[PDB]
Design a binder for this molecule. Structure first.
Ligand SMILES: [Zn+2]
Lengths: 1362, 260, 67, 99, 68
RNA sequence: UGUGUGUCCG
């Protein structure tokens, strides 16, 4: 059928070089590309038949030859395009509007009901709630435009298929605007009377293309003009419209919840900002993004100006103002703006400057940077920018390099000594280092303040290697489904033959990592190390290193590099070795908030050789990559080589990059002056160069971060201060602790801390400049209580909310493999959960998610891309049209039962659920109780068991045997395995994937579940360390639909084509849902009656399933209660007696958990009115011998032996049980590993597997501001009713409940002082200590695995013993 | 007869004992001289410890220095000869001294390579950094005027002329930084921009008892659409603090003033 | 008288010889003490100078193939 | 008994004479050793201070050095590394800066 | 008489034999000062070599650095 | 006829 699948969201940079060809075929004129070769080249076979197309000729009949650039017209199209015309799609997206709104309202009701059932709700509720929501949704500004743009996106996405001959076009006429689409090309016909004019009488869009007299005589008596663009601009416009709609809707809805003050800025100011930005862009072209880019620093400065403002808090805003004024002055002198336009163009940054908002609103506004679009990129300008900063001559100071190297060595030695016991047996003539010999003999380590005169002594230390090269425990890093560069022989084969002007003599076989990985006969870690050691990357055919322009940004262009396959493998191995080896001596601390740290611990840490005040400053880590030279990084690279046994591995980049020819691998424009004769030695010009001395972004990041940490440590040593550093993304924050005496008040303390931070910043700037990397003092700011870093922004210890960046990204369409509905709904649910993690409001995010869920369902039902046009999924799968009630019912039963529901209200309290089945059952019961259809619970939850296998049970330990709750992962895994069977001549993969692999896997999983009683989590944990786990982790590498439908090895296996199988499975899955009454049985339905206990319902539901696996043996460690159903709240008044603890606690009493409120306020911004705005006080088995640098296989074997020994304690067959699991891992023998195995001594293994091993971190799903003002007492439970109670989840539930209950009321209005959590006597039981007993052995031959790839560990005892 | 021989043998033995005792006495004198000459060699520990320390330090420093640079260190004579023609810097690194290269840069006689000039200037421009003047911005007249315009709503009002005259007077008196700091502090503390300008013209000592500048206009056309209400006849003895911001002068003996 | 004189002479000779054995033994003990005293420090000095010479020679050997 | 007494006395005096001669030889060699040991002590004492001051001056002068990077460092390092293992020139064509 | 004379002669012979054995023990123990004498010459030669090599290193430093 | 137009390190 086809091998094409166009993307639904923007994922590529915008390049318009090819459009220059299109306008040449239609007889127009356009100047997009800076390459003259495209002006007089040969047109492709397509986009040349356009002159034979009658529709295009009719379209272009009353328009001038002249055209206009598209980047001047995007805001105009955005403003002047609403849905009122005629569109070819038959079911319009606007038709099914009302139903969506209806669904939204229902969801709101449910949430309220759920809250009222929990006991949180609110106080003094208003009757006018639904009407306000209806008015807000219906009165939105960007409503109809969203539907129109989605219709356009559907049309252009469907049109991009049909790569064969006889292609067709589509036409849309919307009043003023005309649109013609043809195979990834769009023509826009627009009136001229709506374009901004010059002082010379021509539009601003024609300034740089035409002279003043040429354009005037070109237009003549014409009213409409044509612009040409690609299909990416339409997707970008659709994304912008969706984001604006989401932002406006959320801002409008948030006012209803909190009429007085809300954390979202407004819905009137943001519209003005949108209009101002649109006008600025329409005037200035693509150069307006230089001004748009200043939205974030201005917001940061305005947030910074919400404190005491001593001296330095006004410097950053002044610098930003001066910079934006200079930028606006420089890019408008050539353009001939009218005085009115000149006055109007500054309104954007004038409104930005004069804003008056609370810090929360500014932090929310910080996240609308990408709501205006993205610039148009050119290869030439990006290459010229990269060429600078990468060829300049630097000046360095040798003494600073020497000191940095010494600090590097000292840090590594200190990290080795802190763990591992003692020093690392320094060899090599110890008398050369007088001063360290005493410490070595006494077996101690110098503290820190005395390390200033013996620093040079660290240069002479020598030692054996400390880290191992056999520590790779994840082979999936070597096959990741990416694209690489080609060999030097066929370097120019990645360009179009027509644009090039000649047929390249040589062609490549493939360009993808997974296809090249399976054809390498001699792949191995040792082979890669030998390849690196012999300097094989200097071979003449292994020097290409292409470039690629990065995705959506706001710069003139940033690039990343691509290397050939073996050098890519060398890079990956180096990164893995550095990650698991070094770089643990230079960690990233974080959690450096002084106000949220223990005073005694902070004072103890701040000691170098009493109140402690700390400041901080942040520096940007962007241009460091290009500013690294070999003269500075040579000693560190040599030391890294010496710490391992390698010879020439870690300096692969610095040796081969300068020998490469640099170019950007763009399809439609090759480097300038490329001809057949000068093909072996091409010339360098505007888009190429030869000598590259700096680094490349992304490569060798860990080494550079380690060097930066070493520099910071040297600065800390030089000046007697205490420094803490953190690095994330493209920046690093450094905080300085000052420590002060007692009687020094609190006014000059901040000034002194700021002065200390400023002097530290000056010293660091001097050091880094001496190292060859230059900071910008203009862009470096020093503050005392504001730290922004990654995903966390704190102002004097108060966390600021940022939830728009995730909530505004919700959309009906996303890449989920063949437009899977379950994937889209899961993505929407995850986005909703992440958004509700921040902020304090609840309703806007849930309303947005409910709005988008139904829209996605309908748009997938009617306009699926995998089927032919005019196809209805919901018609034939049922035989009757899909009604609203069926969809509403099928969107309510949770996913663990196979029911397409992902918006669990329980997620509003804590992130990780103890038991998905119990929570889902409780939610379904509550939903059915709300409506008057309570007599559907049993037929809904009965269902029919599926035909699964023990492999699936091991993979999902807490699931059910139903076919509707399964993903598409199994299908892809089977496809990959089938492909590997007829392919993969790797000669080492074939050994792993032998003929009887599936038999071995099935036998292992069957044996692991043959104990008594049966435990699922233990089996799942153990199964991952067997070779079956390695095979499974290799199998799952497919990520996208394009690689599924376009791969060569996958689609060369003949058999049934993939598209037909995908259609069949999609039809089956759609039939599984939305049907009901057809996949149920009455045998379990009668057996689940009169239970009235969710724990029991879950237990019999689990036991009835997996019956073909669990014959009659009990199942343990899988069922936990729902914490919503386990506790009840009373909300005691300040002066009263609890009815439960007094009236009904005479005989024995009732256990409970107490919650009380603190009174100290510490800090509050901007006021103490809201609890979220204030913070308070109150923090939220040894072995006999130890190996030295153990390998990955040895560690896995030790862990497996420990687990097997500890679980089976009541038996006496450990020696015969652990034996078959170690023959395939290590060369050692049983009773020798047991010496290394710690003597585990625990009780009731279920508790250790629930919280001690920590399958999940639990954490919390609310902001941490309110957790510091509450004290929770749990010792009142007495005997703790060990038990099924998870204490961390109890604390999280109490804190989240208190936060949700009081979120719109002022602090003084709260009339509740303490809360009692009283537990029921139905869902809480006693768990006794139990152990697993095995009555057989694995009795399988696992000795055939004698390959060194990732399985076998010949000679484990290489590094010695402790 | 044997008595004489016995006596002679005894005398000979006694004499031989005498010179062997003398020999032992001389031997022990030689030994005593041995430790006397050996004593003054043990005092070199203090010297040799420091010698070892400084030698090891120098060894480490220069070993690292030679290891960082490759095999093309480009000795000084080679660099000097290479600068003469095709004055680009030589391939491979090179070594200079701070004073030598500074004096070379400061003298426009020997045609130092350009790239070396920018490299050394960039390296040396960061040595003048203290805790003060680290992030201190440089403010000129035009920049401050634009900053003050960006806050005032509308256009063509009298506050624009007040900003202009304030900027001119500050430039004349070289006190722009104090004016800007006061403006920013007043605006941040809560007052409106107009109030900030009022406290500026009322609080700065240089703006006390000063005659407002007089400008000349040809006719009523120079008067903006937002200044007609502020036009007033000039009273005697104008005061800058009273509300004088400018003086409009005409050729035909006409003077007008503006009041907020 | 002659026998008594001979006995006295022999006794005096024995006293002198045993006295000079005592003196020689004391000198031998003093020499051994002086030797053992002057063993560790000078040996440490020698190895330190040897190591310094070796490292300096290695540095200069690395420097020669540069000019 | 006179002859045996004379012979014994002669043997005893010969032994004492041999002891005296070997003691004198030991004294002579000890004096020679003392002269050889004390010959260069003054030179050592004078030279140690010269080395101390030279090393201190070199260390002080090292702190006033400025180095500028070149465009042929990585190529030279790669050539040296390739020559140090299976010593041969790297395969053609020539590298970026072959000089 | 004669018995006392021969007894004194025997005692003298024994003490002379003891003198000879003590002298040969001293001569055996004296052949160890060369262990404590060659380090002086070794240090002298190594200090001469150190002076030469440090002078060479300084000369290289003047040749390499541009200096004044 | 347009080799999968593209979509890397973490
Ligand atoms: Zn109670």
């Amino acid at each position: 059928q086809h091998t094409q699948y166009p993307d639904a969201r923007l994922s590529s940079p915008i390049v318009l070089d090819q459009c220059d060809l299109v306008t040449r075929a239609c007889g127009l004129y356009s100047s997009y590309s800076l390459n003259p070769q495209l002006r007089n080249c040969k047109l492709p076979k397509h986009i040349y038949r356009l002159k034979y197309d009658v529709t295009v000729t009719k379209f272009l009949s009353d328009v001038p030859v002249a055209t206009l650039p598209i980047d001047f017209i995007v805001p105009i199209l955005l403003k002047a395009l609403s849905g009122n015309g005629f569109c070819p799609v038959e079911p319009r997206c606007q038709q099914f509007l009302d139903e969506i709104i209806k669904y939204t309202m229902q969801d709101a009701l449910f949430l309220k009901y759920y809250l009222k059932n929990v006991g949180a709700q609110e106080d003094c509720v208003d009757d006018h709630f639904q009407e306000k929501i209806l008015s807000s949704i219906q009165g939105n500004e960007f409503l109809h435009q969203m539907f129109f743009w989605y219709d356009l996106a559907i049309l252009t996405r469907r049109g991009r298929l049909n790569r064969g001959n006889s292609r067709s076009t589509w036409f849309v006429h919307d009043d003023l605007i005309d649109i013609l689409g043809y195979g990834d090309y769009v023509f826009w016909k627009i009136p001229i009377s709506l374009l901004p004019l010059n002082t010379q009488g021509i539009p601003h869009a024609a300034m740089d293309w035409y002279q003043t007299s040429v354009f005037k005589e070109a237009v003549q008596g014409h009213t409409h003009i044509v612009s040409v663009s690609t299909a990416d601009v339409l997707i970008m416009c659709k994304d912008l419209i969706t984001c604006r709609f989401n932002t406006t809707l959320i801002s409008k809805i948030a006012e209803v919840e909190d009429p007085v003050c809300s954390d979202y800025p407004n819905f009137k100011i943001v519209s003005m900002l949108y209009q101002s930005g649109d006008y600025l862009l329409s005037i200035l072209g693509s150069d307006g993004y230089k001004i748009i880019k200043f939205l974030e620093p201005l917001c940061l400065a305005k947030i910074q100006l919400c404190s005491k403002y001593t001296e330095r808090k006004g410097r950053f805003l002044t610098q930003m103002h001066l910079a934006v004024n200079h930028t606006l002055e420089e890019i408008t002198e050539i353009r001939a703006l009218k005085p009115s336009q000149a006055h109007k163009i500054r309104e954007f940054h004038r409104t930005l400057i004069r804003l008056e908002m609370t810090p929360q609103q500014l932090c929310e506004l910080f996240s609308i940077q990408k709501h205006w679009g993205h610039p148009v990129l050119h290869s030439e300008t990006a290459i010229q920018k990269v060429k600078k900063h990468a060829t300049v001559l630097k000046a360095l100071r040798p003494i600073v390099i020497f000191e940095t190297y010494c600090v590097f060595k000292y840090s590594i030695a200190k990290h080795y000594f802190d763990s591992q016991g003692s020093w690392y047996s320094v060899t090599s003539d110890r008398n050369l280092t007088p001063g360290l010999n005493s410490y070595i003999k006494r077996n101690q380590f110098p503290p820190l303040p005395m390390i200033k005169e013996l620093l040079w002594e660290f240069y002479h230390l020598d030692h054996p290697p400390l880290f191992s090269t056999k520590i790779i425990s994840d082979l999936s890093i070597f096959i990741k489904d990416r694209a690489t560069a080609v060999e030097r022989t066929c370097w120019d084969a990645v360009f179009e033959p027509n644009v090039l002007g000649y047929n390249p003599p040589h062609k490549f076989s493939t360009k993808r990592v997974p296809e090249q990985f399976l054809e390498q006969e001699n792949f191995s870690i040792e082979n890669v190390l030998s390849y690196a050691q012999k300097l094989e990357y200097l071979l003449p055919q292994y020097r290409n290193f292409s470039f690629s322009l990065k995705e959506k940004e706001l710069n003139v262009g940033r690039t990343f590099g691509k290397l050939p396959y073996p050098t890519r493998n060398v890079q990956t191995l180096c990164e893995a070795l550095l990650a698991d080896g070094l770089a643990k001596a230079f960690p990233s601390n974080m959690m450096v908030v002084t106000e949220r740290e223990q005073k005694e611990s902070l004072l103890h840490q701040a000691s170098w050789h009493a109140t402690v005040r700390g400041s901080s400053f942040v520096t940007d880590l962007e241009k460091y990559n290009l500013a690294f030279r070999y003269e500075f990084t040579a000693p560190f690279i040599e030391y890294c080589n010496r710490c391992y046994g390698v010879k020439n591995v870690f300096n692969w980049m610095h040796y081969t990059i300068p020998q490469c020819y640099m170019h950007v691998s763009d399809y439609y424009n090759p480097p300038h002056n490329l001809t057949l004769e000068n093909r072996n030695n091409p010339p360098e010009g505007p888009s190429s160069y030869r000598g590259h001395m700096g680094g490349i972004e992304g490569l060798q990041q860990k080494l550079w971060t380690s060097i930066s940490c070493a520099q910071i440590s040297l600065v800390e040593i030089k000046t007697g201060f205490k420094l803490r550093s953190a690095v994330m993304g493209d920046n690093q924050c450094i905080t300085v602790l000052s420590v002060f005496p007692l009687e020094t008040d609190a006014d000059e303390q901040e000034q002194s801390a700021e002065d200390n931070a400023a002097r530290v910043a000056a010293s660091l700037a001097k050091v880094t400049s001496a190292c060859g990397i230059f900071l910008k003092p203009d862009e470096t700011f020093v503050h005392s209580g504001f730290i922004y870093f990654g995903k966390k922004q704190y102002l004097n210890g108060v966390q600021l909310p940022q939830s728009l960046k995730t909530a505004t990204r919700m959309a009906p369409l996303s890449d989920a493999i063949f437009d899977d509905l379950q994937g889209t709904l899961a993505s929407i649910g995850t986005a909703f959960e992440r958004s509700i993690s921040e902020t304090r409001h609840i309703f806007p995010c849930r309303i947005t998610a409910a709005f988008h869920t139904f829209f996605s369902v309908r748009i997938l039902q009617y306009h699926h891309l995998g089927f032919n046009k005019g196809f209805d999924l919901g018609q034939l799968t049922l035989g009757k049209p899909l009604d609203f009630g069926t969809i509403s019912l099928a969107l309510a039963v949770p996913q663990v039962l196979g029911g397409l529901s992902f918006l669990n209200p329980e997620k509003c309290f804590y992130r990780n659920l103890g038991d998905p089945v119990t929570s889902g059952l409780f939610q379904l019961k509550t939903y059915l109780r709300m409506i008057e259809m309570d007599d559907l619970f049993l037929p809904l939850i009965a269902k029919n068991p599926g035909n699964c296998t023990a492999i699936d049970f091991v993979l999902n330990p807490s699931g059910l045997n139903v076919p509707g709750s399964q993903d598409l992962t199994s299908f892809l895994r089977q496809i990959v395995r089938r492909t590997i069977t007829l392919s993969a001549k790797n000669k080492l993969i074939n050994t792993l994937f032998h003929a009887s692999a599936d038999f071995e896997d099935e036998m292992v999983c069957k044996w692991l579940l043959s104990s008594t009683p049966v435990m699922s989590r233990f089996a799942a944990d153990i199964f991952s360390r067997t070779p079956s786990g390695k095979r499974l982790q290799i199998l799952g590498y497919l990520e996208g639909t394009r690689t599924l439908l376009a791969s060569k090895i996958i689609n060369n296996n003949t058999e049934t084509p993939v598209l037909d199988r995908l259609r069949k499975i999609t039809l089956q899955r759609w039939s599984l849902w939305f049907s009901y009454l057809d996949h149920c049985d009455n045998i379990l339905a009668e057996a689940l009656t009169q239970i009235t206990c969710t724990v029991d319902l879950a237990q019999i539901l689990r036991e009835y399933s997996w019956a073909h696996i669990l014959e009659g043996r009990p199942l343990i460690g899988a069922t936990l209660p729902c914490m919503i159903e386990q506790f009840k709240v009373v909300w005691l008044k300040p002066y009263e007696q609890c009815p439960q603890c007094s009236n009904a606690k005479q005989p024995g009493g009732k256990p409970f958990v107490s919650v009380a409120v603190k009174k100290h306020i510490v800090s509050a911004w901007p006021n103490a009115s809201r609890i979220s705005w204030t913070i308070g006080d109150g923090i939220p088995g040894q072995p006999a011998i130890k190996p030295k640098c153990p390998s990955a296989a040895l560690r896995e074997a030790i862990e497996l032996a420990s687990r097997l020994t500890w679980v089976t304690q009541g038996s006496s067959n450990s020696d015969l049980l652990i034996k078959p699991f170690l023959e395939a891992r290590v060369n050692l023998s049983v009773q020798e590993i047991l010496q290394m195995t710690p003597s585990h001594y625990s009780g009731n293994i279920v508790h250790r597997y629930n919280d001690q091993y920590s399958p999940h971190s639990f954490m919390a799903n609310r902001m941490s501001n309110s957790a510091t003002r509450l004290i929770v007492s749990t010792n009142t439970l007495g005997e703790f009713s060990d038990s099924n109670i998870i204490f961390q989840n109890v604390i999280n539930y109490a804190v989240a409940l208190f936060d949700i209950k009081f979120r719109n009321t002022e602090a003084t209005d709260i009339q509740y002082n303490r809360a009692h959590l009283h537990l029921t006597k139905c869902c809480t039981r006693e768990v006794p200590a139990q152990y697993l007993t095995y009555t057989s052995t694995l009795d399988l031959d696992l000795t055939r695995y004698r390959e060194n790839e990732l399985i076998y560990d010949n000679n484990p005892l290489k590094g010695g013993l402790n | 007869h044997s008595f004489e021989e016995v006596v002679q043998t005894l005398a000979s033995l006694a004499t031989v004992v005498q010179q062997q005792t003398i020999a032992s006495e001389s031997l022990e004198q030689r030994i005593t001289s041995l430790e006397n000459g050996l004593k003054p060699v043990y005092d070199m520990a203090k010297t040799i410890s420091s010698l070892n320390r400084v030698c090891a330090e120098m060894v480490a420093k220069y070993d690292l220095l030679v290891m960082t640079t490759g095999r093309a260190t480009a000795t000084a004579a080679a660099t000097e000869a290479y600068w003469a023609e095709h004055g680009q810097p030589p391939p491979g690194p090179s070594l200079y001294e701070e004073s030598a290269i500074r004096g070379k840069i400061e003298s426009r006689d020997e045609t130092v390579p350009q790239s070396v000039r920018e490299a050394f200037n960039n390296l040396d421009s960061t040595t003048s950094l203290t805790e003060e003047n680290f992030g201190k911005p440089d403010i000129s007249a035009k920049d401050l005027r634009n900053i003050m315009y960006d806050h005032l709503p509308g256009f063509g009002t009298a506050f624009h002329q007040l900003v202009q005259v304030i900027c001119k007077l500050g430039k004349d008196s070289n006190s722009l930084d104090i004016i800007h700091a006061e403006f920013q502090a007043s605006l941040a503390e809560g007052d409106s921009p107009q109030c900030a300008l009022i406290q500026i013209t009322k609080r700065v000592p240089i703006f006390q008892d000063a005659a407002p500048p007089v400008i000349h206009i040809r006719s009523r056309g120079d008067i903006p659409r937002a200044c007609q209400k502020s036009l007033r006849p000039v009273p005697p003895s104008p005061k800058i603090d009273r509300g004088w911001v400018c003086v409009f002068q005409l050729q035909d003996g006409k003077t007008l003033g503006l009041k907020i | 008288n002659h026998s008594f004189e001979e006995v006295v002479q022999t006794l005096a000779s024995l006293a002198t010889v045993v006295q000079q054995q005592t003196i020689a033994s004391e000198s031998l003990e003093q020499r051994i003490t002086s030797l053992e005293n002057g063993l560790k420090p000078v040996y440490d000095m020698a190895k330190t100078i040897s190591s310094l010479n070796r490292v300096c020679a290695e540095m200069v050997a690395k420097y020669d193939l540069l000019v | 008994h006179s002859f045996e007494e004379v012979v014994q006395t002669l043997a005893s005096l010969a032994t004492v004479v041999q002891q005296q001669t070997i003691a004198s030889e030991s004294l002579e060699q000890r004096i020679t050793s003392l002269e050889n040991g004390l010959k260069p002590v003054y030179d050592m004492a004078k030279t140690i201070s010269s080395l101390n001051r030279v090393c201190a001056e070199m260390v002080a002068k090292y702190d006033l050095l400025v180095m500028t990077t070149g465009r042929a460092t990585a190529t030279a390092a790669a050539t040296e590394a390739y020559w140090a293992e299976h010593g041969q020139p790297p395969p053609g064509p020539s590298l970026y800066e072959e000089s």
